[PDB]
Design a protein around this nucleic acid. Structure first.
Ligand SMILES: [Mg+2]
Ligand SMILES: [Mg+2]
Ligand SMILES: [Mg+2]
Ligand SMILES: [Mg+2]
Ligand SMILES: [Mg+2]
Ligand SMILES: [Mg+2]
Ligand SMILES: [Mg+2]
Ligand SMILES: [Mg+2]
Ligand SMILES: [Mg+2]
Ligand SMILES: [Mg+2]
Ligand SMILES: [Mg+2]
Ligand SMILES: [Mg+2]
Ligand SMILES: [Mg+2]
Ligand SMILES: [Mg+2]
Ligand SMILES: [Mg+2]
Ligand SMILES: [Mg+2]
Ligand SMILES: [Mg+2]
Ligand SMILES: [Mg+2]
Ligand SMILES: [Mg+2]
Ligand SMILES: [Mg+2]
Ligand SMILES: [Mg+2]
Ligand SMILES: [Mg+2]
Ligand SMILES: [Mg+2]
Ligand SMILES: [Mg+2]
Ligand SMILES: [Mg+2]
Ligand SMILES: [Mg+2]
Ligand SMILES: [Mg+2]
Ligand SMILES: [Mg+2]
Ligand SMILES: [Mg+2]
Ligand SMILES: [Mg+2]
Ligand SMILES: [Mg+2]
Ligand SMILES: [Mg+2]
Ligand SMILES: [Mg+2]
Ligand SMILES: [Mg+2]
Ligand SMILES: [Mg+2]
Ligand SMILES: [Mg+2]
Ligand SMILES: [Mg+2]
Ligand SMILES: [Mg+2]
Ligand SMILES: [Mg+2]
Ligand SMILES: [Mg+2]
Ligand SMILES: [Mg+2]
Ligand SMILES: [Mg+2]
Ligand SMILES: [Mg+2]
Ligand SMILES: [Mg+2]
Ligand SMILES: [Mg+2]
Ligand SMILES: [Mg+2]
Ligand SMILES: [Mg+2]
Lengths: 155, 68, 114
RNA sequence: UGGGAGAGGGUGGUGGAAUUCCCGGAGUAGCGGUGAAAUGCGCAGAUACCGGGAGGAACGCCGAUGGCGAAGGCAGCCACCUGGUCCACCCGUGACGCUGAGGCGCGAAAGCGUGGGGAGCAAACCGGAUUAGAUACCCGGGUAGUCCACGCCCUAAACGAUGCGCGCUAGGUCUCUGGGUCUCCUGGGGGCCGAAGCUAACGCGUUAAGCGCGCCGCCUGGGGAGUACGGCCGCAAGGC
């Protein structure tokens, strides 16, 4: 807000992987403050991304995450009388947030019926470079590229 | 770095003294202000008037291109 | 084909144009914000000018250009960036001189310039 | 008598920068313009670039919080013709002074007449936008006019909103231009802060709006109205 830069909340590490990054992904799945249900679905996905592909879920998950991180985004700023889509770098804190949110949102677009499955399948295709989350990243990345001419309007 | 200092006894009214005068022009050709020339009020006018005279005579430039 | 030549930059508030000529002064190739692909106000931007000087250098190199002398005219906001693009292009930049035309109180300007 | 400073004024010459148009070379896909656009211009070769030619207008740096003039106002450079003014010397004249109803001249810009000139700019006008509309503001065009000569007009926030001359009433500081012995002193201009005093306050204050004398002009609630009638001036617009 106005006064001072607020403090970032560090999440209590997950009990299956001891990972602060995994905890975040969990919370974005959490509807209605029902974390336990969100815990299953994600861990269930760890089960699924093991069966349909014999390797470490944490390795699947984390690599999938990196492939969704946008390095450049466009933030609107109506200078003069027109709305300019100013290109901006994305801080790692936001790169994390946007990748995770999109990753879960991309999951909820898929046609597979169980939540456990979708999370797996998106995380599966994400590390392999596909999936709606990576589609959104590439989009937002080209938009900032397209508007490279407004580099001098950056804050 | 006042130019009036860096020269001996010299004539302001002398419009043919190209070597003295050329010191009073900027690298871009413009006549230098008092804050750079160190001349008093009265001297400046005599200087300016003769510098212009010389420019007509081909001894001094009216303008020079700015090199970097 | 010419090794040494000239690099003229006409950069105004609305656009930046770059023309590469031979030492005699005959243009060899040229570019601008429109040539790079931009329209409207985007032509005046520094990034536009950057692309302009490059496409002007790229085409120039293809005809044997190696050395250039950069002549600058206009006080646009894309000016200095054009200079940057020519140096980092692969061209020699043996000199850079600003030669913007300034009258000695010649003609009366338009209304917007008084 | 001797000296100085200055865009004071008039006439004739003349120098470069830039804009425009035209000719040549070279070159290609756009240029221009805006908040963003469009009108517009461009493959019938534009823009941008180099060379040449033509023409008009204004004089960048110097340039200043500067200088000059009674005001309007005056700025590249040269020469001629010409006004005002300041200093020093303390030589000449012997009150020859000050103001000034009428009168006379001068009087920015726009405007008018006759004839030139016409690059840029630009009332009117055309177009493109904006907008509810946009007879505007912004953009592309554009005719008078802006320039010269001669003759008219005679208005204004023609302002310091402060009539002219003179004497007297602390100083401090910046500046221009003279003269001394040049530390500085002494004149004449240009600002700032201020003694006393003034003033309704704001502010003025040796450049008075202080204290005094002389002369002229002017005011007497707001509107109606700088209108009407009359008169004088003007080609008219219109002015008094
Ligand atoms: Mg998404
Ligand atoms: Mg001499
Ligand atoms: Mg433009
Ligand atoms: Mg005399
Ligand atoms: Mg041609
Ligand atoms: Mg030319
Ligand atoms: Mg000036
Ligand atoms: Mg005597
Ligand atoms: Mg006697
Ligand atoms: Mg009198
Ligand atoms: Mg009278
Ligand atoms: Mg008049
Ligand atoms: Mg007139
Ligand atoms: Mg007329
Ligand atoms: Mg006329
Ligand atoms: Mg007629
Ligand atoms: Mg005529
Ligand atoms: Mg014309
Ligand atoms: Mg219209
Ligand atoms: Mg309309
Ligand atoms: Mg209507
Ligand atoms: Mg217009
Ligand atoms: Mg026009
Ligand atoms: Mg007419
Ligand atoms: Mg007429
Ligand atoms: Mg008429
Ligand atoms: Mg006046
Ligand atoms: Mg005034
Ligand atoms: Mg006065
Ligand atoms: Mg009055
Ligand atoms: Mg009054
Ligand atoms: Mg009077
Ligand atoms: Mg002296
Ligand atoms: Mg004084
Ligand atoms: Mg005062
Ligand atoms: Mg007092
Ligand atoms: Mg009184
Ligand atoms: Mg009070
Ligand atoms: Mg005083
Ligand atoms: Mg006085
Ligand atoms: Mg009073
Ligand atoms: Mg009454
Ligand atoms: Mg009355
Ligand atoms: Mg009347
Ligand atoms: Mg009247
Ligand atoms: Mg009458
Ligand atoms: Mg009157």
């Amino acid at each position: 807000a106005r006064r001072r830069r607020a403090e970032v909340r560090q999440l209590q590490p997950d009990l299956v992987y001891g990972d602060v990054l995994v905890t975040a992904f969990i919370n974005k799945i959490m509807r209605d403050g029902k974390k336990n249900l969100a815990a299953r679905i994600f861990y269930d996905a760890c089960k699924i991304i093991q069966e349909k592909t014999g390797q470490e879920p944490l390795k699947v998950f984390k690599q999938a995450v990196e492939n969704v991180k946008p390095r450049m985004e466009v933030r609107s700023r109506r200078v003069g009388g027109a709305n300019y889509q100013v290109p901006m770098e994305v801080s790692p804190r936001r790169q994390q947030s946007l990748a995770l949110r999109w990753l879960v949102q991309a999951a909820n677009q898929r046609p597979e019926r169980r939540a456990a499955v979708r999370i797996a399948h998106e995380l599966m295709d994400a590390a392999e470079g596909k999936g709606g989350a990576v589609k959104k990243k590439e989009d937002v990345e080209r938009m900032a590229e397209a508007n490279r001419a407004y580099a001098h309007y950056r804050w | 770095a006042k130019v009036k200092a860096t020269l001996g006894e010299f004539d302001l009214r002398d419009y043919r003294n190209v070597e003295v005068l050329k010191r009073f022009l900027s690298e871009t050709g413009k006549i230098l202000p008092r804050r750079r020339t160190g001349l008093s009020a009265k001297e400046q006018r005599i200087l300016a008037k003769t510098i212009k005279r010389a420019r007509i005579l081909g001894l001094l430039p009216f303008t020079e291109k700015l090199v970097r | 084909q010419v090794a040494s030549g000239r690099a003229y930059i006409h950069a105004s508030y609305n656009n930046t144009i770059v023309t590469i000529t031979d030492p005699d002064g005959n243009p060899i190739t040229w570019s601008s914000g429109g040539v790079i692909g931009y329209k409207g106000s985007r032509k005046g931007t520094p990034y536009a000018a950057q692309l302009a000087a490059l496409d002007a250098a790229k085409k120039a190199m293809a005809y044997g250009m190696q050395s250039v002398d950069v002549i600058v005219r206009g006080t646009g906001a894309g000016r200095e960036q054009a200079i940057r693009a020519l140096q980092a292009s692969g061209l020699q930049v043996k000199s850079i001189v600003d030669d913007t035309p300034v009258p000695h109180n010649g003609c009366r300007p338009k209304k917007k310039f008084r």
